[PDB]
Design a protein around this ligand. Structure first.
Ligand code: GTP
Ligand code: EZZ
Ligand code: MG
Length: 170
């Protein structure tokens, strides 16, 4: 089977861990426990191809902005997560993408934009800004909720599809 190293990146508290744990355990983590760095290996079937996903759940805390370089070189796909109710986390996406492009020295890195916490009545970033940002990067935009499980599989599986296309393309 084919391996895919996926990196989940974004500001602290956007729901990187809640999304990964929802994908892997079908459980919603309601408590906020700031991640240092966790990794999970999961076997899933995607479009009839058996995939071995090696998911890296990274630290959103800015004091861990030094571990980034190593995992950005090794990562094959990046799940760039922001929370739709946190404008700063949306602005932080540009910074994560610029860093990934510098480290990879490339314009096209397999990447998916994720708007998490879609279950909340208090969005500060409207869907139009999000769609336009992803459009400007040339990447899929997925709306998710780690609480309801909305778009969780779509987010990770779209990223795998982006990597697969990139490999077939290169
Ligand atoms: N309503 C709602 N709450 C969410 C969602 N995703 C995460 N949360 C909550 O937001 C808080 C932070 O979620 P985390 O997954 O721990 O955030 P994180 O990005 O992994 O944080 P760091 O590891 O510090 O970067 C927790 O209280 C979660 O329950 C979601 O889609 N909806
Ligand atoms: C191999 N898995 C058990 C863990 C794992 N999953 C990943 C998914 C994407 C990118 C990297 C990784 C790693 C690590 N492998 C590395 O080379 C590396 C460098 C720095 C790190 O912070 C972490 C890793
Ligand atoms: Mg976390």
């Amino acid at each position: 089977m084919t391996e895919y190293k996926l990196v989940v990146v974004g500001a602290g508290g956007v729901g990187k861990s809640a999304l990964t744990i929802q994908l892997i355990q079908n459980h919603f983590v309601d408590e906020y426990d700031p991640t240092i760095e966790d990794s999970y290996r999961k076997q899933v079937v995607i479009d009839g191809e058996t995939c071995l996903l090696d998911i890296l759940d990274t630290a959103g805390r800015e004091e861990y902005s030094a571990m980034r370089d190593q995992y950005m070189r090794t990562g094959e796909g990046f799940l760039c997560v922001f929370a739709i109710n946190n404008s700063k986390s949306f602005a932080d996406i540009n910074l994560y993408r610029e860093q990934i492009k510098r480290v990879k020295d490339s314009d096209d890195v397999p990447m998916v934009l994720v708007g998490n916490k879609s279950d909340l009545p208090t969005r500060t970033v409207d869907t139009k800004q999000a769609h336009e940002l992803a459009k400007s990067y040339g990447i899929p935009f997925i709306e998710t909720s780690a609480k309801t499980r909305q778009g969780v599989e779509d987010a990770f599986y779209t990223l795998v599809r982006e990597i697969r296309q990139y490999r077939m393309k290169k």
